[model samples]
Target: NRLPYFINYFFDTYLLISEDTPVGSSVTQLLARDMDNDPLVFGVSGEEASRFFAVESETGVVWLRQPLDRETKSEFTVEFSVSDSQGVITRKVNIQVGDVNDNAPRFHNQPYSVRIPENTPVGTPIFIVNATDPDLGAGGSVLYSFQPPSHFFAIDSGRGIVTVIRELDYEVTQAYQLQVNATDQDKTKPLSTLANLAITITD
Candidate 1:
């Protein structure tokens, strides 16, 4: 008379996904052996077990029941139960979610407006633009640029900082309308967005 034990000591699987990681995709396989060669039944249980994952009762194959979002949930601990005719054993396993370059850079606020004196000096820092990407690593890294190529202003591509490169003239030009573009450095597929600004010069 003895309790059944798992032939494998530990079970671990890291799940990777992108935007289109299909539903019902196999995540991992569970394998265990009985000491007596008895028939075994495999089952899974825990919080979010039924909602996110599915298992084959006989084969012990675990699959995704629904799509996973790294931004929403990144890690999970699920419990697995294996039973023989005589006894049942339960174990907990940790599963990790992987990052994907699926998101685009988005400006925090849109349609910026500002006023500057006509006598503003050249090489003066004027405004700062900020953007955010929910993705991780290089996918989240962003670069900035301004549209139509400006001679009056310059933008720092790495930091999203804007500065005046030429003297402001209220007599020649009353106002300036420019658009700044933000792009992510995602290796797979880069995404981009644009934000506009209106500048008025005062005498």
Candidate 2:
């Protein structure tokens, strides 16, 4: 008597997709073989799995039904199985979502305006800029800086803290306008955003 069993195929496969990949794109093709030449039925099962992915019953090709965002869900697993007359063999496949620098950093409290006493000492902390990005990994990393030719204020690139470099004088000018920039770590095509700040000096 001959026994039936699943073929010598690796039970797992990893698929990666960019966050900006369009919906309805083909993620990958799944394959399962039976040594007994039995007709196999392939399927995937999970909660709301059909909302994101779908597989061809006959061809076993998986398709992306919705757009992916690594920030939303970085990684997920789903159940895939093939059944024949003899029995059913199930396997788990991992889907890795990749990130892209498609989103720009956004300042939390924009249109910032601050009032301080006149003749403030130099190197005093004036304001701290804060921002966030929706991407993951390096794509979501943000750096802060002030516009060039800034003699009155300086910003820490890593801390987002803006300090007054030169003494402030209400006599020279009542107010000063500054621009802040936040950039992402996208080497090839980085994304950036700007925020405006107004500093008013009072006697």
Candidate 3:
């Protein structure tokens, strides 16, 4: 059997000591398959080395102790080797971690398009656009904000409701291209979640 690569994590503290080395010095060499076929991992590695682990052994089975990254992408390749009283052998394996939308908001309609009456007067309520984040709890905390000053539009900061703040007269202006934006207040700064409104007027 070969000492498999022990899984590591980013920003974690880890050590690498041979099985014959003294205690408290790093990893004390790779652990072989025990009665349950589970490998032993003394501790997790830091971010720089967490993504990878290599052991040149000639005798035991290897496996990552900690889980892999899922919120972001990662790739790692490590070498393995083992040596017994007879001889030594070596091998290599690679690991790739994918990403999840951990801090992003998903909108029912990414960009909403709507048509309002050309004569829609001031205070006329238009429509509401919403966004949702799949992240647990506060991960989806999204806040709304409007963009571009237009005499033709206004929005509800707390409700995502867009209304005609001023008359949208088609004769005077055939179209009202308004811009609205939102950001997750939590982890996703400005790009995590958002809703874009495209308002049109027809006589």
Candidate 4:
């Protein structure tokens, strides 16, 4: 039979890879059947694609051969082919590498030090601490917060802005030491970072 019909061939489908999916892990099975009753073989093409996945020639099972980083490479389109006695059918499939909470939030500047006048009013902006995470989606979303004895200052989680919550007193307490934390929104494998802040009230 020539130009045999292909059955059960997925088109533009995405495969997800969790960060925990280790090397040598096989994903869901993929199969393409020949309607002409001809024997068929399946495999993936391209050197770039072959580096990450290995497909079984007969069973059509796809295996992960290398680690995937969502932050570095989010998705890849690779060619998969099925050959029969009649002809070869090739198509590209999407491989979506999902993000994992493998990275912790990192501050751009550590030990942030700032000086403000004692006459500065409450709710005045003091400092803005910036941080970044390598992961994507919610894994990269960072929330800022202050540690204990944080009654004097408040931080905006989304904007990373720090503002004065209580009145400052240079004569009573000239320097205030604060601890700020940056945490990712990964409930399963939460990651966080701590930063030291020094605020000095001037006369």
Candidate 5:
């Protein structure tokens, strides 16, 4: 099977990064070698690692000058190459910058569970819910929505806030479950997030 005998394939690596690091934060990090399985070939004794864009090694970790562009609604790939021979062997990896949920809605926590006091009044501002996205442009704009089995609660789309649309009384209802949704302003390819707030009113 001596068909030039120079071929290598790798699983295209994919990564997601936060939009921005704090003012005094460090850059992101990636592995220098595939820890799971490091194989040797033709006297070559080193693993290859790289990123689509420029990355720097700092304080024992890798960092980027800026975060991935969460604004662009496009897809692209970046590849990693390795070479140590007369022919300069090479490998390719695809990188796709997914449409950041820059404007997706999110709960205070992944599964927001809360307990409310008994006999809560309507529009009592039981709790405040907020959402954020990393994109700087339209992608960063967010909206709030909800889908409840009953129309008991509502959200303020403009403020990314949630409030009770209907009245509540601990004696009448103590525990409730509902889902809140957040999405970007972009309709073509918007980024979205979600959160859940559980309320239990006790008597």
Candidate 6:
């Protein structure tokens, strides 16, 4: 028989992996019908000349050959060539890279400073600290928390808006060094960064 057809050659069409998955890791093994006998060869290639994966001819096992960055390219397609002696036929496969909690939250402004009158009323909105993360999903989200001076000021965890919880007194202390912790809400292990804020209680 020449150019034999594959009854159930391509079993899996879509596959998934995390971004930055270790190189040389076996992604998935493909299926071929001619495999019932020897001499069956399976070859795969990407549309983009810069392919990131290689397939084993002996078995249908696919292996990652290069690094993957979700930010750059989240998804890609590969075409399969299965040949036995008769004629070679083509198949298709898709790969999707998932996001990981690899980025940590960072403060926007480094030299943070704000001045408020000593008689600043309670519940008044003060300076707001902003943080950002490159990761996706919950990993990119951040929450704000006061490291110390919690008694004098409070920040809304979700909003990062600092509000005066207690009355300010310039006579007692002219200036105060405040610290805020920005933590990512990653589903897995979280990362935190410190933000230093200088507050001047003026007359």
Local distance difference test, each candidate: 0.79, 0.78, 0.51, 0.82, 0.51, 0.79
lDDT of 4 at 191: 93
Best by lDDT: 4
Determine the C-alpha RMSD for candidate 4 after optimal superposition of all C-alphas.
Answer: 2.7
Runs in model 6 with CA error above 4 Å? Answer: 2-13, 35-38, 47-51
lDDT per residue, candidate 5, 16-101, as tens digits?
Answer: 44544333344333333332333322211123223324433221233343345545523334443322222333334344444444
Runs in model 4 lying further than 4 Å from the true structure:
3-9, 85-87, 109-111, 134-137
Q: After superposition, how far is residue 121 of candidate 2 from its true place, in Å?
A: 2.6
* Model 4 agreement with the true structure over 26-126: per-residue lDDT tens digits: 87566666557677788888989999889888877888889887767888898878888557778877777776789999999666999999989999998
Root-mean-square deviation of Cα positions for candidate 2 versus the true structure, in angstroms:
3.2
Scored against the true structure, residue 37 in model 1 reaches a CA lDDT of 78
lDDT by residue (tens digit), candidate 1, 1-203: 55655443345444444434679877777788776777778888877877887879788887888887787887777788888866778887766677787778878766687798988888888888999988888888999998877989988999988889987788799898899988888876888888997888888
- lDDT-wise, the better of 4 and 5 is 4
lDDT of 6 by residue, 32-66 (tens): 66544646777776556137878788786778888
TM-score-wise, the better of 1 and 6 is 1
Q: How many clashes in each candidate?
A: 0, 0, 17, 0, 7, 0
Provide the TM-score for each candidate, comma-separated: 0.87, 0.80, 0.48, 0.82, 0.47, 0.81
Candidate 6 backbone collisions, by pair: none
The regions of model 5 sitting more than 4 angstroms off are 1-107
How many steric overlaps does candidate 6 have? 0
lDDT of 2 by residue, 89-118 (tens): 667767788878788998997778889887
Question: lDDT for model 5, on a 0 to 1 scale?
Answer: 0.51
Task: Say which prediction, candidate 4 or candidate 6, comes out ahead on lDDT.
Answer: 4
| Residue 8 lDDT in candidate 2 | 22
Q: Residue 136 lDDT in model 5? A: 51
TM-score quality measure for candidate 5: 0.47
Instruction: State which candidate, 3 or 5, has the greater TM-score.
Output: 3
